[PDB]
Amino acid sequence: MLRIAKEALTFDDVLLVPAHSTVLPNTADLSTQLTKTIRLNIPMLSAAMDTVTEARLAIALAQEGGIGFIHKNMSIERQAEEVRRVKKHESAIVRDPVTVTPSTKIIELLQMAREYGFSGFPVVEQGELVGIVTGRDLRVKPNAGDTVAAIMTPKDKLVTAREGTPLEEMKAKLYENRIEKMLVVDENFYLRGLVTFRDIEKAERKPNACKDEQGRLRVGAAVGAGAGNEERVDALVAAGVDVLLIDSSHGHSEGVLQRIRETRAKYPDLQIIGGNVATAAGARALAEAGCSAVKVGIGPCTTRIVTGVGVPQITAVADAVEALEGTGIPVIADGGIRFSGDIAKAIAAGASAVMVGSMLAGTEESPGEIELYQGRSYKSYVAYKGRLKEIIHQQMGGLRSCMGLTGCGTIDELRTKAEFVRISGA
Amino acid sequence: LRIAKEALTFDDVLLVPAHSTVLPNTADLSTQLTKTIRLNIPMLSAAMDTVTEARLAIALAQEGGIGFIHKNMSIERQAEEVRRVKKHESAIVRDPVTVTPSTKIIELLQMAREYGFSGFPVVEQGELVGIVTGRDLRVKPDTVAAIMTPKDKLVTAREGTPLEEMKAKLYENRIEKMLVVDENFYLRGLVTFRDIEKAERKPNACKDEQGRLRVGAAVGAGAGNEERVDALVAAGVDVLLIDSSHGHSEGVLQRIRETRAKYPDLQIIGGNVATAAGARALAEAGCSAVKVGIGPGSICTTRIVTGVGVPQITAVADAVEALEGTGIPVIADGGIRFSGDIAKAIAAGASAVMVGSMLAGTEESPGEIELYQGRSYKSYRVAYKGRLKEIIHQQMGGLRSCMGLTGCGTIDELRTKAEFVRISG
Amino acid sequence: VVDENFYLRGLVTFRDIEKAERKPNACKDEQGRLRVGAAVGAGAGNEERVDALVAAGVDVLLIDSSHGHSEGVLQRIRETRAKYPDLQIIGGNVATAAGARALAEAGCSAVKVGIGPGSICTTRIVTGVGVPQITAVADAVEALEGTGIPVIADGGIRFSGDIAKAIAAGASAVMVGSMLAGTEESPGEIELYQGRSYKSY
């Protein structure tokens, strides 16, 4: 007998029923929990694709509320760097300022002063910040061949802030210490950058930046389920990554489940996402192995045509959610998302966020550099799509519009309150 | 039947390659726009509302050519565009946070906690009167006027001051901020060692004898433009574009004769013509340059509608030959599709080319970025072509190769030494 | 089968000599080895490459530039010729009578003609320079009418009729690219795509 489990639905099969609503679109709460502990401001993830997510894009996205996942087609030593660039990224901090050493001749200092001003030259000998020289230090006339070491400000009398310090704290330190520039060190008092009042103003204001408990941007990064990835993991976790993505084309494989169990045994507090599954059991299987969230999407596609396996996206999500009802383990809709409507449907199926790839490739912040070809602008490594900021705004405009229509003020209500109609092709 | 001759366009000729001591990267793209104005690249931007405004006219000047502000706007804004270009210095911070002599010290401390007491410039109706700093409030003497630093002890630079001279002023006066005023001591901006440092370096800027970017501006040949001209000439436009759809009309020739007697020294471009007779006519009227192009525009609506036109190559050579002695240059206007067309235009005798379609849709052109379908466009829609600088490089890349192939190291050698072959389809 | 230093190179049986494909039209040298050319650029720093190929027994050397009529090409050609008085050299590309004698006097053994007509013709359009191929060939041929130095028609050969026209214009041989790219023996791997066979790079 023909073994058909059920009937299965994709995006184009359903529409959301509009409801009574006290919800204005610009007042909708777009936030939602990615894991039990990580909470996004917009419910969006960027695919760990070499064409989609690198350090550049994953920052832009966190500033706007979501999280990017550094793709894994790069060395361990380099993937760990991309993770670190995001966590420590403050556009307000001037990162490559001109420094000197105690060995620097004062003669060379007046030369540089004529080229950067006596606002302040950081003195470093072998990375350790040891002091700074200002024009107020250069009073009285240097005898022939003096060096900075005699006139500089010592380490003890410096006013610094640590990296990851909030920005108004720095303003407070800057104002109350009646200074115009303040050095930013690290745990070991290594010079990391500097900050000014103006550099804080020209830092564009991202009120919905998705950050950690210490105000650093959040970042994810992806690894394989094959053997031998443990070292990359150790390197990434070392780089301070917020969430780890173990991506395979079959999350319900026992080998995936094992590397997860191992990674979970090794890093009990690390937020881990496993994927991809498309069934009630595949999600429950992944949860047991120790996921913090589960990514859903098997041929949302080329996978369906070559292997014949797949599940339409809407029922796949509903089944996973139905199985995870009560665990606080969220579902991620991955792939097949063309417009804002698919996003809205995804969440209303129960999904807590979505992952997109094609939609982001070609954005300014995406990998590749802009190249003009046949009078058109493209991203050379695809159609150049412009700034990510707008694509998000355009997409979230749509989502916001939807929540007003369905009377859902928050994401969780949309995942629970919104209703569907089953529809035909016509 | 009066058929004067046969006339040739771009697709009709190829440039013949010659002995060459010219590497493309060593070729001299400069050329004289008029006897007095000399370009660094032989490119003008069309005075089209979709192409040239202050923003793009700046970008092109930074690149070696000159943009022509279109005339489809009120004077008060057009003369403004001419200023926006002439006065543009990328290093100057404009619209900084200021106070007035009336500002309550109470209000002074609030802003200080949100911008720092580095110094708030004090202006009384735009006129710079002083600056109040944190040393002034802890020092004490109520309002800002009582604690502010007076006009006498201020260190300023005038607008248009070179950057190295400002840098010297900042060091020799031991300051990190220096305010920028104009002729009437009105505040225009400020400069620090850092903002002069991040100022983009444009070594091929077409600048005037005073280091300001050069700007053109276009007006029509009708009556009632006299006030517009005077406004632009007042606004410091470098060269004036008198553009008509028939440069060989007696009314054009007259208004040109008039403007020239009025501004004996003002550089004027008249157009458009496509004949030897149309060319001398415009020169005798007193043009400094002659623009050629009746019929070849991109969105070529003439001919078809009117039956009139000249294939662009024949027109240019004919005008060039008629002006062989006057030191008055010719411009090839419209119909430039690829960089090969540029090369052919110049080798026909042109001293520069004017382009529209090639530039419309760059970031710097008018219009807003808009995402449509799944691609980027400039919405007023046109295809977003990215930054102008990239296009210019590709286009001049092409021209350099041609000159390398043809053994012409300078534009002028290309205009005189390069040969053609005629070809079929 | 050994070589000059008695290093093993292979073996032969009565049978393997029997299945060896018989190519009666092989272009072989005065020593029955297949003839081979090799191409280098006209820039500086190729001197070591040339010497390596000449050492490797290349039969004829191809000095190819996008402008064979450049003085630098003419010079590097003058240099290589004084160095290998006997080495067969092909210079290109030109498209004029003047470009042709220039290359011959520099010491070319053959002259390659073709500025503008390549298949993926990116010149002209971009640079405005070129010559329709027939006129170029006849012009170079006529300029070399006495030198016993042959001309090659390079690029733009679409069909066999074009070959015939090229030669009848004066060409002694033709050089083709597009017509050959994608044959089994060209570089690339066989790949099945869509539902058809392609050579995947």
Added chain:
Amino acid sequence: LRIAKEALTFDDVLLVPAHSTVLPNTADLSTQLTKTIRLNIPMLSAAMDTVTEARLAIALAQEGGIGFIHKNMSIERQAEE
């Protein structure tokens, strides 16, 4: 205006047929490439990385013409080809 001449391409001409004692299968396709090198067919393969390597340069030589190994490779491999 300096227009040297008119210039012709393939589509511009046809070859005129003449009296003929020549059968196609009896035609001599050989020709001198240089004073010293003589081809059997009048064909060279372009020195293009997508066209000529040792493999194709062998096949063409077997057929009467000469292939030209492209230069987009390290010497040690080109001299090898």
